[PDB]
């Protein structure tokens, strides 16, 4: 229960037998033999009991007896006994009366391994026996059988639709064909960015400042001059030389506040986005306001691509993220949720040290390049929209026909701007973005791409089927064996005909 047990055998061996050859030799040999044929035997036999690791074919057979599987169709015994064709297989045998050392062409070569019903790999035998246990204890439930198919044939690992792993069971419930939970993204210089069918608004007054008066500077210390916005000639991600520079001189603890209509609301997720390029400093600092002192803070490293700092002065922060864009550009996004209604403004500043704050002292004059601010509700950055003293409201698209999937855009897609979609449609889900349209600059109505595979319903009553094979490279012998009703390894309900087949 608790206070130890010996069982060491070598306990017999007093201090006297300290220089003995023979007594200690006998005791050590006896201990080794008892170890070999009790402890090692029981360890190997427990590994034999373990069905997940029944590599030992003898254990697979013990399980064929336990579950009651007909073992005629299994492929136990060691391999390398079939001649067939090829230098990797056996060869015929003759009358080597002299018994030469190479043992003529082979030590054997037989027809063992008759196909079209018999599986040879022992791993699939283990899978089959697990499936038969599932069939024995099955009550016909479909979520249960799907989860156990997952567990057996994928070791409980989620799979994508490029696999086409095991499928449903007796449940004559066809899936979809309407389209639901649809999302659309557009691919451009902003990369992978979604669009909203509902009116989304950017509340910042100006997204790209070219004048200092655009965003004022706030500095409680006021030790030095405030941050000054300066127009710069650098290729902005939109494809223009319209970026701006924020410069923090040495000894200055100022930050530029973007004028925003206030307040933004109580208990609403707030998203701040903007585009930055590495300059003199390697990183930038941003703050989302709230009631004093509940301001949320964040710092984005423009080079390493790490959001190394996000400070919660209260329950504000939810998420912070950086999206990579070509020419060394980064969209820094901060999503903040606070039950307060005091979201007043967003402050930006250059940072000297990797954890420098919005008002941290700067030892030098450091400049950074920013462009294209955006402040919205929700919790996800959206397509950048130009604002010049206006809280711009815009609606990306309207889905005119759900069944056919044709989608109407507010404006025609610019040339080179691709469109991806996700959701479920035509009895198939697209959990990954699937391209369906390339912008030509003149058309705005586009037809979606077919998602996953098989209409699905398999019309009928009290009878369905499986679907498997493009994923796991299951043997045709395996599929044929599972398709035999006599063996009865498949989870079945009486009064349902289920054929496995299906690749």
């Amino acid at each position: 229960t608790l206070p130890a047990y010996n069982s060491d055998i070598q306990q017999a061996l007093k201090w006297l037998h300290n220089q003995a050859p023979g007594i200690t030799g006998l005791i050590q040999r006896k201990a080794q033999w008892y170890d070999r044929f009790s402890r090692q035997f029981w360890a190997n036999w427990e590994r034999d009991v373990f069905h997940l690791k029944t590599a030992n074919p003898f254990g697979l057979m013990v399980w064929c007896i336990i579950l009651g599987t007909p073992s005629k169709g299994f492929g136990l015994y060691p391999k390398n006994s079939s001649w067939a064709f090829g230098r990797l297989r056996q060869n015929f045998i003759y009358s080597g009366t002299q018994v030469p050392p190479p043992a003529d062409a082979s030590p054997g070569g037989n027809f063992y391994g008759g196909g079209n019903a018999e599986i040879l790999n022992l791993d699939e035998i283990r899978k089959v026996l697990q499936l038969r246990y599932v069939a024995l204890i099955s009550n016909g439930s479909i979520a249960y059988i799907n989860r156990m198919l997952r567990y057996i044939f994928n070791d409980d690992e989620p799979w994508d639709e490029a696999t086409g792993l095991y499928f449903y069971l007796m449940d004559s419930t066809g899936e979809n064909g309407p389209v639901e939970n649809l999302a659309i993204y557009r691919k451009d210089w902003e990369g992978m960015v979604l669009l909203s069918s509902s009116p989304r608004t950017n509340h910042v007054l100006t997204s790209t400042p070219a004048s200092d008066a655009d965003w004022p500077g706030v500095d409680p210390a006021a030790s030095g001059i405030p941050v000054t916005v300066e127009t710069a000639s650098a290729t902005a991600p939109d494809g223009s030389a319209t970026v701006c520079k924020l410069t923090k001189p040495a000894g200055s603890t100022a930050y530029v506040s973007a004028p925003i209509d206030g307040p933004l609301g109580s208990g609403s997720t707030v998203t701040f986005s903007f585009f930055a390029k590495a300059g003199s400093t390697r990183f930038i600092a941003i703050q989302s306001a709230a009631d004093f002192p509940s301001r949320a803070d964040a710092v984005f490293d423009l080079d390493s691509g790490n959001v190394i700092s996000d400070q919660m002065l209260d329950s504000s922060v939810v998420s912070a993220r950086m999206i990579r864009l070509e020419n060394g550009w980064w969209r820094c996004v901060l999503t903040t949720k606070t039950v307060s209604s005091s979201f007043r403004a967003a402050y930006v500043a250059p940072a000297e040290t990797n954890f420098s704050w919005i008002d941290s002292n700067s030892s030098a004059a450091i400049d950074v390049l920013i462009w294209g601010a955006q402040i919205e509700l929700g919790d996800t950055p959206t397509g950048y929209l130009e604002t010049t003293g206006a809280p711009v409201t815009m609606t990306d698209y309207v889905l005119q026909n759900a069944q056919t999937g044709t989608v109407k855009f507010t404006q025609p897609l610019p040339t080179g701007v691709e469109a991806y979609w996700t959701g479920d449609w035509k009895g198939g889900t697209a959990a990954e973005p699937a391209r369906f349209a390339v912008g030509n600059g003149t058309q705005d109505t586009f037809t979606l791409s077919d998602p996953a595979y098989i209409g699905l319903p398999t019309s009928g009553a009290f009878k369905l089927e499986y679907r498997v094979g493009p994923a796991l490279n299951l043997s045709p012998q395996l599929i044929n064996l599972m398709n035999d009703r006599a063996v009865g390894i498949m989870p079945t309900c009486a009064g349902c005909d289920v054929k496995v087949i299906q690749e």
């Binding site: 006998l26 044929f37 009651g68 024995l136 009064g495």
Partner: protein
């Protein structure tokens, strides 16, 4: 000095023994190399004792390693294997009810009054019963043994009395109880493990068969899916609805209990079919027993059937070889095998087929060395006289519906 694992044919871990050489080789090169390990010497005797102890160790380890797979296990060891699949080992019953007694006047019938039925009943009276001057009372009864019993419906005989209490009788209102008997099933538990292998499962042929087999006094059961619904015939038994599970239960279980178990193994939305007239015997004609849905709502109906009873016969011709006299141990073997007592070969079940070669094999099981010559069998319906020697053949088809029963007197053996 080795553990031979029979990979698929015998599924047994077998010891190899021959450890004496290994043990004396250990004594060598440890005590030296010139040890005289011949017998009649101290070292030889003790090395022999060590070898014997190691052989016993190997035997015991092999047995305990083999007991995991069935067909080689035994009590409280095969029982764990059954309990893995939830095959309940089984429960007991010994109680009757609502008998009848006719007596004289103002008599107090005795506690545990012994009465014998013509099949050696030996039943005690449970309640302390005092009769009435009218001349009739009711007694509760319990069998002397825990074994499964079925008393005859008519009053038979008495043991313990007072010369006044005339006799005990049985009425239709008397209830019969259906008992098990320790584990009976010592090797037919091994036989029934393969059938009741989906007790814990529901909504399937195997699940239905297992769950209805778990009902007491279901000695056998047949369940046919008939899944390819176009009416037709599937694995025997002509059908009416396209797809319906057909259940034929043997034995004499409680109607309500077996119906409730059949309902619990509901299968879902597939109906019950037992039509085509002769296919089995209807339990309640049309519109079988209703039973109530545990998911409270509505009053459904569950329909199954009972097999057509058959009476089998056997004539054997033996030679009494090896000078080992055994005149009347043959029909005992035949009925023992038919009842399902033997291991690995389930006897006459609802789907069986009475075979001369099978019964000859059973006789060879229970007594070798007699040189069976002729083993004719044949069988007739539940009634009917003996089928005459002309009918006696080597095989009876015994279609999927219908069960044959072999009596001790129906089997006759002639010595040549």
């Amino acid at each position: 000095a080795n553990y031979n694992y029979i990979v698929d044919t015998g599924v047994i871990v077998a010891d190899t023994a021959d450890v004496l050489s290994d043990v004396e080789a250990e004594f060598r090169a440890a005590l030296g190399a010139n040890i005289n390990l011949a017998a009649s010497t101290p070292q030889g005797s003790l090395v022999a004792a060590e070898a014997i102890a190691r052989s016993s160790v190997m035997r015991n380890e092999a047995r305990i390693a083999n007991t995991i797979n069935p067909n080689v296990s035994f009590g409280t060891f095969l029982d764990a294997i059954c309990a893995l699949m939830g095959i309940e080992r089984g429960s007991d019953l010994s109680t009757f009810g609502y008998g009848v007694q006719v007596t004289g006047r103002s008599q107090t019938r005795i506690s545990t009054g012994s009465r014998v039925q013509t099949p050696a009943g030996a039943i005690f009276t449970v309640l302390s019963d005092v009769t009435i001057p009218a001349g009739g009372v009711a007694t509760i009864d319990i069998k002397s043994q825990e074994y499964g019993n079925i008393p005859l419906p008519v009053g038979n005989l008495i043991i313990i009395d007072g010369t006044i209490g005339w006799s005990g009788a049985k009425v239709i209102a008397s209830t019969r109880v259906d008992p098990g008997s320790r584990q009976m099933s010592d090797a037919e538990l091994k036989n029934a493990r393969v059938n009741r292998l989906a007790i814990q499962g529901r909504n399937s042929t195997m699940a239905i068969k297992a769950y209805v087999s778990a009902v007491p006094n279901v000695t056998s059961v047949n369940v046919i899916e008939n899944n390819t619904g176009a009416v037709q015939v599937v694995n025997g038994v002509s059908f009416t609805l396209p797809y319906a599970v057909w259940v034929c239960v043997a034995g004499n279980p409680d109607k309500q209990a077996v119906a409730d178990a059949l309902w619990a193994a509901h299968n879902g939305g597939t109906p019950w079919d037992y039509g085509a007239t002769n296919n089995g015997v209807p339990v309640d004609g049309p519109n079988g027993v209703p039973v109530r849905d545990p998911a409270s709502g509505r009053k459904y109906v569950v329909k199954w059937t009972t097999p057509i009873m058959y009476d089998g016969y056997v004539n054997v011709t033996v030679q009494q070889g090896s000078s080992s006299v055994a005149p009347e141990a043959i029909q005992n073997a035949v009925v023992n095998y038919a009842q399902g007592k033997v291991e690995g070969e389930e006897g006459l079940v609802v789907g069986a087929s009475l075979s001369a070669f099978e019964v000859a094999g059973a006789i060879a099981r229970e007594i070798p060395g007699i040189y069976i010559k002729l083993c004719q069998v044949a069988c007739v319906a539940a009634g009917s006289p003996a089928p005459a020697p002309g009918d006696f053949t080597s095989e009876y088809v015994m279609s999927a519906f219908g069960q044959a029963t072999i009596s001790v007197g129906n089997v006759r053996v002639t010595f040549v």
